[PDB]
Amino acid sequence: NRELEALKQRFWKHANEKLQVLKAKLQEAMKLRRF
Amino acid sequence: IESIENLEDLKGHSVREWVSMAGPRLEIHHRFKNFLRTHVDSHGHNVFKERISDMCKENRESLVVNYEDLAAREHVLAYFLPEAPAELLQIFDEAALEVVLAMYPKYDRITNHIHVRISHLPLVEELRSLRQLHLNQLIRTSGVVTSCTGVLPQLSMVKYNCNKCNFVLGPFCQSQNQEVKPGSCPECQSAGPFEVNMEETIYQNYQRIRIQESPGKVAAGRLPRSKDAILLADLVDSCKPGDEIELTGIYHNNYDGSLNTANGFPVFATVILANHVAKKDNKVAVGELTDEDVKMITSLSKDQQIGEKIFASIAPSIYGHEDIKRGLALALFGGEPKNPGGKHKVRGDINVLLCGDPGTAKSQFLKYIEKVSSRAIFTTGQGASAVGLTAYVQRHPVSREWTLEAGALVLADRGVCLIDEFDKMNDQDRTSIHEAMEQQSISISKAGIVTSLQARCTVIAAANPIGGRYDPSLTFSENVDLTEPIISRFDILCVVRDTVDPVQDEMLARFVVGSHVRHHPSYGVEPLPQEVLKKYIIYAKERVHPKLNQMDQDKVAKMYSDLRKESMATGSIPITVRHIESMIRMAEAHARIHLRDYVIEDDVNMAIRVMLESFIDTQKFSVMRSMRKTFARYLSFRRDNNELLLFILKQLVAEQVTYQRNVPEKDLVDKARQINIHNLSAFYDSELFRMNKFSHDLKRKMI
Amino acid sequence: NCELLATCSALGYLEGDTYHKEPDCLESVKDLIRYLRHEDETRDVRQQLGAAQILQSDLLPILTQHHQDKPLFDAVIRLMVNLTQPALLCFGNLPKEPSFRHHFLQVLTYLQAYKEAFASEKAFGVLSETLYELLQLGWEERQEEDNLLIERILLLVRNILHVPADLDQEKKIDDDASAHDQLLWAIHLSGLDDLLLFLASSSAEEQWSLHVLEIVSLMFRDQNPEQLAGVGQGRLAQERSADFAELEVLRQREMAEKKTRALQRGNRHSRFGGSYIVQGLKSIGERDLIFHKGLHNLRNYSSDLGKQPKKVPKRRQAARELSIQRRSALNVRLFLRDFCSEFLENCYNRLMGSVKDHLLREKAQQHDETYYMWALAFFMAFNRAASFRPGLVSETLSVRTFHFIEQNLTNYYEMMLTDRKEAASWARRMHLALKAYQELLATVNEMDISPDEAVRESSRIIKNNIFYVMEYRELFLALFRKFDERCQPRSFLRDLVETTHLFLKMLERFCRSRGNLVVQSEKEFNFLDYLKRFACSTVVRAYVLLLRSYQQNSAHTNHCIVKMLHRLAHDLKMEALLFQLSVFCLFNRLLSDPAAGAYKELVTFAKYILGKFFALAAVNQKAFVELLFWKNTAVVREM
DNA sequence: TTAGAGAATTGGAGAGTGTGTTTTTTTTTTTTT
Numbered sequence A: 001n002r003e004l005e006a007l008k009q010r011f012w013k014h015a016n017e018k019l020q021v022l023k024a025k026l027q028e029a030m031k032l033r034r035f
Numbered sequence B: 001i002e003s004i005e006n007l008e009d010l011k012g013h014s015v016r017e018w019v020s021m022a023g024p025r026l027e028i029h030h031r032f033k034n035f036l037r038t039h040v041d042s043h044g045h046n047v048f049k050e051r052i053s054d055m056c057k058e059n060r061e062s063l064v065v066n067y068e069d070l071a072a073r074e075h076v077l078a079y080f081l082p083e084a085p086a087e088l089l090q091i092f093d094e095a096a097l098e099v100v101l102a103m104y105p106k107y108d109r110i111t112n113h114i115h116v117r118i119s120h121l122p123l124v125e126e127l128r129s130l131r132q133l134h135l136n137q138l139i140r141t142s143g144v145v146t147s148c149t150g151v152l153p154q155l156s157m158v159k160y161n162c163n164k165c166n167f168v169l170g171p172f173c174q175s176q177n178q179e180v181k182p183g184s185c186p187e188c189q190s191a192g193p194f195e196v197n198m199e200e201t202i203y204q205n206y207q208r209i210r211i212q213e214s215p216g217k218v219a220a221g222r223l224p225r226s227k228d229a230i231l232l233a234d235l236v237d238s239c240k241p242g243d244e245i246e247l248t249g250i251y252h253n254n255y256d257g258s259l260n261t262a263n264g265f266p267v268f269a270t271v272i273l274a275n276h277v278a279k280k281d282n283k284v285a286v287g288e289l290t291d292e293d294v295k296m297i298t299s300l301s302k303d304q305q306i307g308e309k310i311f312a313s314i315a316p317s318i319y320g321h322e323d324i325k326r327g328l329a330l331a332l333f334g335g336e337p338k339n340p341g342g343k344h345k346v347r348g349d350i351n352v353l354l355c356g357d358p359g360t361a362k363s364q365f366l367k368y369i370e371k372v373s374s375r376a377i378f379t380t381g382q383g384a385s386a387v388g389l390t391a392y393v394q395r396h397p398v399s400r401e402w403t404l405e406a407g408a409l410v411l412a413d414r415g416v417c418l419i420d421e422f423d424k425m426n427d428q429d430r431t432s433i434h435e436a437m438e439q440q441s442i443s444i445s446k447a448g449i450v451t452s453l454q455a456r457c458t459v460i461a462a463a464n465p466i467g468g469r470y471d472p473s474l475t476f477s478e479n480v481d482l483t484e485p486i487i488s489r490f491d492i493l494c495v496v497r498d499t500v501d502p503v504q505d506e507m508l509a510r511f512v513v514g515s516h517v518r519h520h521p522s523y524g525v526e527p528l529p530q531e532v533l534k535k536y537i538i539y540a541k542e543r544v545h546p547k548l549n550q551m552d553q554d555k556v557a558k559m560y561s562d563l564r565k566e567s568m569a570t571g572s573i574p575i576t577v578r579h580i581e582s583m584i585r586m587a588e589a590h591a592r593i594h595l596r597d598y599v600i601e602d603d604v605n606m607a608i609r610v611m612l613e614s615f616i617d618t619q620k621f622s623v624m625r626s627m628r629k630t631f632a633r634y635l636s637f638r639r640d641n642n643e644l645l646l647f648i649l650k651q652l653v654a655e656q657v658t659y660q661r662n663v664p665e666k667d668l669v670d671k672a673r674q675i676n677i678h679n680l681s682a683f684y685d686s687e688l689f690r691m692n693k694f695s696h697d698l699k700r701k702m703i
Numbered sequence C: 001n002c003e004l005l006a007t008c009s010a011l012g013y014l015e016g017d018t019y020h021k022e023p024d025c026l027e028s029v030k031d032l033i034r035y036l037r038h039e040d041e042t043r044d045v046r047q048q049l050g051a052a053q054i055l056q057s058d059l060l061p062i063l064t065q066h067h068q069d070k071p072l073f074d075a076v077i078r079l080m081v082n083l084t085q086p087a088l089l090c091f092g093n094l095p096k097e098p099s100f101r102h103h104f105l106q107v108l109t110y111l112q113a114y115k116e117a118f119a120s121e122k123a124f125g126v127l128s129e130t131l132y133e134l135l136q137l138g139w140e141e142r143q144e145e146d147n148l149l150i151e152r153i154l155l156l157v158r159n160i161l162h163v164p165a166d167l168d169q170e171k172k173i174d175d176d177a178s179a180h181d182q183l184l185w186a187i188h189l190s191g192l193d194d195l196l197l198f199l200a201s202s203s204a205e206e207q208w209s210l211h212v213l214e215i216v217s218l219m220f221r222d223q224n225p226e227q228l229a230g231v232g233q234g235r236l237a238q239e240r241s242a243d244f245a246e247l248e249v250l251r252q253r254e255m256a257e258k259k260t261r262a263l264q265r266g267n268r269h270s271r272f273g274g275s276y277i278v279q280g281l282k283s284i285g286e287r288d289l290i291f292h293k294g295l296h297n298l299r300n301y302s303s304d305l306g307k308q309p310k311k312v313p314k315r316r317q318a319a320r321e322l323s324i325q326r327r328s329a330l331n332v333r334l335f336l337r338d339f340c341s342e343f344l345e346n347c348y349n350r351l352m353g354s355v356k357d358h359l360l361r362e363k364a365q366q367h368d369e370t371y372y373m374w375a376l377a378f379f380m381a382f383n384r385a386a387s388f389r390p391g392l393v394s395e396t397l398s399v400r401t402f403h404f405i406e407q408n409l410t411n412y413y414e415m416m417l418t419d420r421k422e423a424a425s426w427a428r429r430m431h432l433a434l435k436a437y438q439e440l441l442a443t444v445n446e447m448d449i450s451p452d453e454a455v456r457e458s459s460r461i462i463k464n465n466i467f468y469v470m471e472y473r474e475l476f477l478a479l480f481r482k483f484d485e486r487c488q489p490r491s492f493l494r495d496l497v498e499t500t501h502l503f504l505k506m507l508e509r510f511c512r513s514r515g516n517l518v519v520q521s522e523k524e525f526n527f528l529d530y531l532k533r534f535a536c537s538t539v540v541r542a543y544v545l546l547l548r549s550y551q552q553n554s555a556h557t558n559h560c561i562v563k564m565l566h567r568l569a570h571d572l573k574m575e576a577l578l579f580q581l582s583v584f585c586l587f588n589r590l591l592s593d594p595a596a597g598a599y600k601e602l603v604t605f606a607k608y609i610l611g612k613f614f615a616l617a618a619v620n621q622k623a624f625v626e627l628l629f630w631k632n633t634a635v636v637r638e639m
Numbered sequence D: 001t002t003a004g005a006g007a008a009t010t011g012g013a014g015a016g017t018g019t020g021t022t023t024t025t026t027t028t029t030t031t032t033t
Ligand SMILES: Nc1ncnc2c1ncn2[C@@H]1O[C@H](COP(=O)(O)OP(=O)(O)NP(=O)(O)O)[C@@H](O)[C@H]1O
Pocket: B317, B318, B319, B320, B357, B358, B359, B360, B361, B362, B363, B364, B365, B462, B463, B464, B508, B512
């Protein structure tokens, strides 16, 4: 399936709700602060 | 109150009560004070010292904080801010007041409260996507303002006179939820018809706006959703009906019996408590410009090739059309309105007409001007009306009295009105713009309304000739189908042709294919970046005002006289008196491009060149060459004057050699200021001294 | 508030799953204990620390992750015992006024939150490990340092088990893990249950017998012995099929009632008019009745079709049962069955002997005999359920336990009648005593059934003793003649009736088998003249009061009621005592029941007594007036 | 063992207070005439 996976890779190459995302990625920084 | 080393451990609380209690409140207060005092940008410059200083210079009572900076510098405040926005914004306002009164101890005379506004919040939401999950949270939305109340006074801390005795009831806080009922007087227990003490009551500005989804973001054939938003204090008149805005605010809900009886279910009304309004039009205001920005602009103005750079920056993806780029640059920067004696107004805006063949980038030029300019209105042909262009009267939507409303020309009052497919309009729609084009006003006498609105805009129109192909066998007047009153209202009148020329076709093809390569999703002089150009434009328009001292009246007067003669001869274009005032306007526009506070003969010669070249362009083929030699030999295409400085240099060298035998650059420039040939940089770039083996150096000053 | 906030912050903070304690934890915890000791009577510090949730956020992490730091661990255990102190101890009673009751509800809410938090297995694992490594030492090796720690550990477990279920979250449906079920599962997985079995079986550590009894009581608070003893491997299929069948039964009953109502009203809308004169029926005046409620209603006309019922005044409002029964989680039920089995086999005799020694020596709190009587009822019922072995409970089978229970029951009866301001509480204590007495009387029957001639001999001995002594016979009449619906629940009335039925069954069989004439300075006796004491109006009034709920009663309860009334009617010829108008209304409901076939015994008895009444009425029309009132010896004048 | 006379508590009748209400024409504007 390597050529099929290569076609998948080409389509991924051309490939190019958020409060919880914000809080998580900020939670990492405050954990680093405490450490 | 001991300092709290970890705000992040809520210890089972929710954010609202956790920040409402005293310990975390003081910790948040100190953290925000420290953030304001110590936050620095990538260059190490303390940004908030500058911002607070500008706010106190201009008495603005409001401080915009970038959420990206807050999140980068102090994490937990950015963490708690969207969760409990009212509480943390109150704490931020207190802390900002402390810092402001540390910087300016006497600012309490100007304000008693500093409003912290939040910008660039990542919690962007579509209006159609707001849910109950966003309630009491700081959201950010986009839309077009479709309604606005007048700025109304609202009770904020109200006091009531007792209905019998002379006592005054204590301060009650207004909530946005319901009317505050006083209760009963604590001196005597009466509860009768109480009345507001106007003098002791504290009021605040109130304005209720309605925003809806922008018409290009709604689907075709689908009705737009809308929200009410409350603007308080210095946020009032941040926008007008028609403005595209981004709105950061608290999404708030309260019980409404009217909605409950309308729906049959306990539905709660919703409103946005606005915290920050930013017009998507004015991405950069004049107040947003930093000392770095204005230093960049002023230093960039000293390049001395800046005119060519500014011209080249007009639509950098369009090959050629240097005359179009020149005319559009002059129109975009604009002249100065004048009113000698207070009784004779003359417009300062420059109007442009691009007529010519299909596939010649006229519409692309118009869309570029739309993108780059603040306050751009774009309209097309049959899509416009007389009424819609100028102004329209309607029954008011709720109260049903006749009310006047702003058309495109009024909405573009200090901006650009762009009219594509200009020849395709109706005559009745096209004649509406005459008053706005010349007198810069729109006078309406309809349904009891009798008034004149300001329409001081610059009109940039695009058109095709008759049959959709320009004919060099005929003059402009013979193939345009427009009439003299509208033709004369356009200062700059451009003809664009698509004639075959193989070398130019090859270069144009290479430029176009290179553009398609460059812009994939992934002339000589070099342009500015478009961000820098926008900042430069607004600085040049708002912070600079050219003034004309002299313009060598004989030259322009003789030019106008024989331009009138040749226009009467060929019939190509009416010249009237407007072309003279177009000369003054174009000179002021070029001075503004160079950021000159005073107009000079450089600018006058530029304006002269633009007028003469466009008039020559209006002619037929055979007539065009004779007209070229006529106006070129007799009138002023003052390209350069190197010979005078050449022989001045030769004379000075000969005298110096004669003196020494039996600082020359200082000698040369002294003579160059004595004679009216002051533009010496052209001579230093030209070949005439170079092949005569002279040279220059600003340090050594030897030649 | 802010100073408490400062100390609570000074405890430390959690990060991910690891707690980072500050070095000043010891002095901050001592300060917290000082604030709690210097509380207001409103228990403000209790409310504030519960609101701050430091028990959930700091003390449990400290207890679970820094248990090697022994001074801090001891201080935290003492602080947690103080915080988990039950609300009834905090305020002394249920407050009678709104402000203290609001404070009581606040403390109770935070106690429920603590119980929710305490279901983590790690906390009980640490508690079991520290108790285990403490009890590993010999008793003589212990000092006040370790004995007080055992007291505080067991009191913490007691406090967490004691907490009432939240009224909000007690709506859990059967076969679901309530907070108490999760707590018991935490005890099971931590192995503290085995430590409780060890403490109960240990002769050396008998000093903690009352504590261990209270733990076991609060553990088995919700359970029923026979239902628990029936648990086993194959229960999932049984309970699933039973749930489906019961669902269909409920649905069919609702459909039948809906059809009956649809027939009672007409097939025309309510504003469809029409009025009738019922010529024979005089109205409240002399004019004929005008009927407006539709022709359909005149098939089963009654004058109370449109009447509002009456507000029962507060004093006359009947007592209601304090909790619904719910089938707990199957894992917890299996664990409790195994606990009860192993406890019964290994612990029960020594624990009950120790508790009786404590009560004799009078080094127990005021009402610990209630726990003793609870344990009698529960574990003897569980023993009789499944494999009955009297050796496992032989410490309880002595006549001294009968005497102790009878004394307690009479004491509670007197205190219920006199101490009127907590008469319901005295009634509940008396209910526990009654259930213990009932289980002893059931156990002797099981001993009779069992094959061992030795237990048959001792069963005969104890039966002779009990039936000889007078108080065991007179107590039933004493209870019936001053029972009150206003104070005692219908569950108590059920238990009293069933215990009376069992007691009279045994006494009748005993006297039928052999004479044994002398009773009580002795006197003669016979069971017929004993039964004639049950011919009073009050006892039959109570029996018909229980009969009113025949739809909801158990089949055994209905058999008890109808057998007693049949004994009084058929064998003592006292039908005129039971000729009553309210009883006849109940019989009218019984005969009109659509499910009357399910109550064949009751309707047959009702028709027997009704036929006797109508024979007497045909002979003499004054019987209709006699129906209207309760009576004394008009039972013979009518005859 | 029942029940009846005197004292205290609870049910509800009713007196008092506060709230809410009774197709038509001229003008514009876009599209269609
Ligand atoms: N000199 C040029 N350089 C780059 N692109 C060009 C040039 N001339 C035409 N084009 C392209 O031609 C296309 C059509 O441009 P457009 O502005 O619509 O033409 P137009 O002047 O409006 N003709 P018309 O709409 O019939 O009046 C665009 O994609 C332009 O980029």
